[PDB]
């Protein structure tokens, strides 16, 4: 990812596509009332338009924990396949 990202609360996903998790956002001009519902649990917070923009500030940068290496595990997954 780059240093500056320009997405969040504009042209966003408004609703979920599955039934396994129920998403409901309510966008005003400034903030948004998101309502998430997964399983028995529920949560609903207020995400500002400048709260999603600070999300991509410090990146996650996922990386694979392999037994030997990612190369070897992809060959061994093919031999298992």
């Amino acid at each position: 990812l780059t240093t500056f990202t320009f997405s969040g609360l504009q042209d966003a996903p408004v609703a979920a596509l599955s039934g396994s998790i129920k998403l409901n956002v309510a966008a005003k001009a400034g903030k948004a009332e998101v309502t998430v519902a997964a399983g028995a649990a529920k949560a609903a917070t207020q995400v500002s338009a400048a709260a999603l923009r600070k999300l991509s500030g410090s990146k996650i940068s996922l990386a694979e924990v392999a037994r030997i290496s990612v190369l070897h595990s992809s060959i061994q997954n093919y031999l298992l396949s």
């Binding site: 924990v65 990612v70 997954n77």
Partner: protein
Amino acid sequence: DRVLSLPAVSKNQVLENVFHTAPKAPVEHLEKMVSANSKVYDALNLQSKRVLIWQVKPALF
């Protein structure tokens, strides 16, 4: 020559032509597939102590 009126095929040659092959046990299919499916359990279960799921699809952390 009374022995030439006896059946010339021995009692030995009957017991080796009637019992020619050692027969397959009923339990040797169980205890040979079970020991081979215990390796299918080990490698491929998700509750085994030696699963291959972290060796073939390394986890994204």
